[PDB]
Swiss-Prot record:
Sites of Phosphothreonine modification: T115, T185, T460
Summary of the function given for this chain in its UniProt record: Catalyzes the reversible isomerization of alpha-D-glucose 1-phosphate to alpha-D-glucose 6-phosphate. The mechanism proceeds via the intermediate compound alpha-D-glucose 1,6-bisphosphate. This enzyme participates in both the breakdown and synthesis of glucose.
Active site residues per record: S117 (phosphoserine intermediate)
Similarity comment: Belongs to the phosphohexose mutase family.
GO BP annotation list: carbohydrate metabolic process; galactose catabolic process via UDP-galactose, Leloir pathway; gluconeogenesis; glucose metabolic process; glycolytic process
Molecular function terms from GO: magnesium ion binding; phosphoglucomutase activity
Catalysed transformations (reactions): alpha-D-glucose 1-phosphate = alpha-D-glucose 6-phosphate; O-phospho-L-seryl-[protein] + alpha-D-glucose 1-phosphate = alpha-D-glucose 1,6-bisphosphate + L-seryl-[protein]; alpha-D-glucose 1,6-bisphosphate + L-seryl-[protein] = O-phospho-L-seryl-[protein] + alpha-D-glucose 6-phosphate
Name under which the protein is recorded: Phosphoglucomutase-1
Organism whose genome encodes this protein: Homo sapiens
PTM-bearing positions, type Phosphoserine: S117, S134, S201, S206, S213, S362, S371, S470, S478, S498, S529
Sites bearing N-acetylmethionine, chain numbering: M1
Gene Ontology CC: cytoplasm; cytosol; extracellular exosome; extracellular region; ficolin-1-rich granule lumen; tertiary granule lumen
Amino acid sequence: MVKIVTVKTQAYQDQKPGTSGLRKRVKVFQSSANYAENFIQSIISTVEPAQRQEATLVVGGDGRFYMKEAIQLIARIAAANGIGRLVIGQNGILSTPAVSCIIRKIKAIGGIILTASHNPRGPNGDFGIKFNISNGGPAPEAITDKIFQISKTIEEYAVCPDLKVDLGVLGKQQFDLENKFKPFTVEIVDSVEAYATMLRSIFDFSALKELLSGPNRLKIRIDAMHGVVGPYVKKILCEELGAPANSAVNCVPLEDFNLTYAADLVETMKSGEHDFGAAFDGDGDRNMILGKHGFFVNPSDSVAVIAANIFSIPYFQQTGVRGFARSMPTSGALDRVASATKIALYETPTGWKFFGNLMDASKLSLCGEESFGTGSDHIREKDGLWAVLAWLSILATRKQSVEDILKDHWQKYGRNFFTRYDYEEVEAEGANKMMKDLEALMFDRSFVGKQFSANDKVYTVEKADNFEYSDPVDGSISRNQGLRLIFTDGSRIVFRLSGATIRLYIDSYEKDVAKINQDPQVMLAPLISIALKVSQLQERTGRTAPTVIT
Ligand SMILES: [Mg+2]
């Protein structure tokens, strides 16, 4: 039956798998012969031969064009290489938090996820291949380094050319490989079930069911933006929890699609009909939270509100709260909440690996970042739909509007006004000059102490550095992670680099009750001015304005 053939291949040189996997244009995975084949083989060749027959890999993607074709490739190469089994979501569909869930539930060696996050879908669009390891999280640098090494010097791979998988039908498919003994096994599983079952156990589905249907039900609008979370929204929020069907918009994943991307949802909330709104990104690991009339809960505040009401979530009632965490550029809203408890607050460089490590050491329960990310140690990826059900949980217990909840939070903890300026496609030379100069300035002896007037408001430098982080688990040192100007009132200016892109984060703390409900862009203006003056950004880049304000 099913023959195994060796295909001589010519290696590529730009297959570096990053933190979110390998992302290229789809016309590359199609014009470039054996481009995908090479990489899938490289990933699989990191699994020792002796461990393959007993191994299971989870496979799924975000619905984008070329996904199903890709999953077919993976099966043909997994089989010919001796991987014993694939678990694949029906139709190829699995959200990234669903994959993390399933890897951990069935103890797979890892998974291959076909997504490209927020990136455009279609023939003239992007496609990405991401590898996760046995703890359900993204492959660390050491693994992705080996895949890259293998890919650059690869000379052959193995495939089952004639092997096809019916992704439409539930159940176990088997394949008799020529000159093998044990069969290749594919399990097509319901896209939503294992994940929904996890959520069912985390949250009080009875309470949420009550909240979302009947007399004075909470009216909600959930925008999956034609991404992967769609089916998860329909099966859980509507079908199981009883939210009316029109609660769910764009919940059909399509093969071709910040604060301006959910412009649709914002307009809808702005009518004043709904009490709560939410949107998700491509693969389900990010979330935007909205209140009546379009009230914007910024991601930094959102993890803080969740932290402050965390015990209205059954999961945390039972497992307890092992720690809090945020990325360094996220606002210090969370810190104010952690400060009123006995629970540690870790501040990490941007990146998942840092959270995952603290989680794996039983030191982190809740984590968030300013880039629309919220998560917990229930899995090892960020979880957008989970964040929404945490909020609904909080709403059902608090019984107040979303805006009244933030107002109460700000009155208790003070407010951390936050914004992020993006400057996109700036000339690298100018930006790097800007960073190198600003750091040199900051590093001077008589810089700590230096004052800056708004005026009226006066800020004083408490600390200024290029953020470093020793990871308490892997021991790694992460250097040059962002310029931080830290002020004595608990306000911060942060610069990061990533043509090029500058990110300016501004975090202004206000405790005054007559100041906490003012317009953020007005309250932030003095620190923004200070930021631009000290960095000489307009002078170094030519930009009189950011590309995007969040
Ligand atoms: Mg994402």
